[PDB]
Design a protein around this ligand. Structure first.
Ligand SMILES: Cc1cc2nc3c(=O)[nH]c(=O)nc-3n(C[C@H](O)[C@H](O)[C@H](O)COP(=O)(O)OP(=O)(O)OC[C@H]3O[C@@H](n4cnc5c(N)ncnc54)[C@H](O)[C@@H]3O)c2cc1C
Length: 388
């Protein structure tokens, strides 16, 4: 029966715990593994918008998520001289409305994990080899130990090890949107109070905010550049590149970068999308960022994770565990919605920053209203199946 189907879920992020929840709810018995020692605190702020809110509510975690929501009261577009060009309330500023809500990743994962306390999960575990035939998937762990599963569902992030292990270069594209993103936490030297400031130029923008930690501020950088690092993983090269890339930006960049060396949660990566004709191969399926990351410019990453988790578990349910039928349904039903939200992210990468002109209240406001409407449109551009 479905209960006795062995399913390995790799990655305790959003998609992994999400798909584990729905699989369990739909009569299956999944198990989770995680490379990290434990759930990482805080981190990037995730949007739960569109249909993802409906899924969250059915999961019985929506009120919990709201209890832990970000509490930015005010967002401001400012020029390099610190003048306020355009101001908006927090939710509107983040292009959210209605029941939509923003929550830090770590907080959301903790909530997700509490919702699946009955599901076996093993941290500090890593898969080093995967092999499958028609009957089974053989998983080799770090210590050389081996186990067999009927199915493996990998939710191990945009830099998916599993994707590289299972798929060839012809079976997926890493789509570069010609821009970089960086973020780190610093002392709230400005004394921001549940407020975010955003300053921008023709190719770059810098954000600075404080929210749930009063004596801390989260700095953000987004910019376009065709430059390539000799080693994109080299944190020292990242900080040198970022500093040199913003040396003449003005505004608070000097004050922010002066505090960068002492920040301990530094993050830097290219803005990238994962494009796959098929998210699956035999008994293995990718999900979440590993399968179809829409990049931070889309704001749809979380949305796609929840929807993917719901549909995949659903189609497996309807197929009574027949993964071949389910995986096909998984690819067909979900791709257009993924592609829609990915194209939105691409659009943001190409037209959010003013090409020629300097920002003003009129532009900031019109652009804000336009993005709010458009994101609402794409985030709801799928008709969610009812598996129950
Ligand atoms: C700077 C930034 C800002 C963002 N902003 C937004 C936003 O505003 N709105 C939005 O909707 N989305 C945003 N996103 C995207 C969003 O964070 C993700 O799409 C979402 O968390 C879903 O990710 P996931 O669960 O598929 O994988 P992840 O959240 O990356 O989790 C993967 C998990 O698997 C683990 N793992 C990794 N490799 C392995 C391995 N080999 N073996 C075992 N475990 C492994 C990781 O430690 C992690 O816990 C942003 C992303 C970034 C980087």
């Amino acid at each position: 029966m479905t209960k006795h189907i062995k399913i390995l879920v790799i990655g305790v992020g959003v998609a992994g715990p999400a798909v584990a929840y729905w699989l369990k709810r739909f009569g299956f018995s999944p198990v989770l593994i995680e490379k990290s020692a434990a759930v990482r605190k805080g981190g990037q702020a995730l949007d739960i918008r569109g249909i993802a809110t409906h899924i969250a509510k059915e999961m019985g975690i929506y009120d919990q998520i709201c209890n832990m929501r970000t509490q930015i009261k005010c967002g401001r577009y400012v020029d390099v001289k610190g003048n306020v060009l355009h101001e908006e309330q927090g939710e509107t500023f983040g292009f959210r409305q209605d029941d939509e809500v923003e929550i830090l990743r770590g907080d959301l994962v903790e909530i997700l994990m509490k919702a699946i306390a009955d599901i076996p999960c093993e941290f500090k575990q890593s898969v080093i080899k995967i092999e499958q035939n028609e009957d089974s998937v053989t998983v080799t762990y770090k210590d050389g130990r081996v186990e067999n599963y009927d199915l493996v569902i990998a939710a191990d992030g945009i830099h998916s090890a599993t994707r590289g292990m299972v798929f060839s270069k012809n079976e997926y594209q890493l789509i570069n949107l010609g821009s970089y993103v960086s973020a780190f936490t610093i002392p709230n030297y400005l004394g921001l109070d549940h407020m975010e400031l955003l300053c921008e130029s023709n190719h770059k923008l810098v954000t600075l905010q404080s929210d749930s930690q009063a004596d801390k501020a989260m700095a953000g950088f987004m910019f376009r550049s065709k430059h390539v690092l000799e080693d994109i993983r080299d944190e020292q090269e990242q900080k040198h590149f970022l500093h040199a890339s913003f040396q003449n930006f003005g505004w608070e960049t000097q004050n922010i970068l002066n505090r960068m060396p002492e920040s301990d949660d530094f993050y830097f990566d290219a803005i990238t999308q994962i494009k796959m004709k098929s998210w699956t191969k035999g008994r293995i399926a990718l999900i979440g960022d590993a399968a179809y990351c829409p990049s931070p410019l889309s704001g749809q990453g979380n949305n796609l994770a929840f929807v993917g988790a719901y549909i995949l578990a659903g189609e497996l349910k309807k197929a009574d565990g027949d993964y071949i039928q389910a995986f096909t349904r998984y690819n067909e039903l979900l791709h257009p919605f993924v592609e829609a939200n990915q194209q939105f992210g691409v659009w943001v990468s190409e037209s959010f920053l003013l090409k020629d002109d300097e920002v003003s209240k009129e532009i900031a406001e019109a652009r804000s209203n336009k993005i709010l409407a458009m994101i609402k449109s794409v985030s709801n551009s799928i008709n969610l199946p009812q598996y129950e």
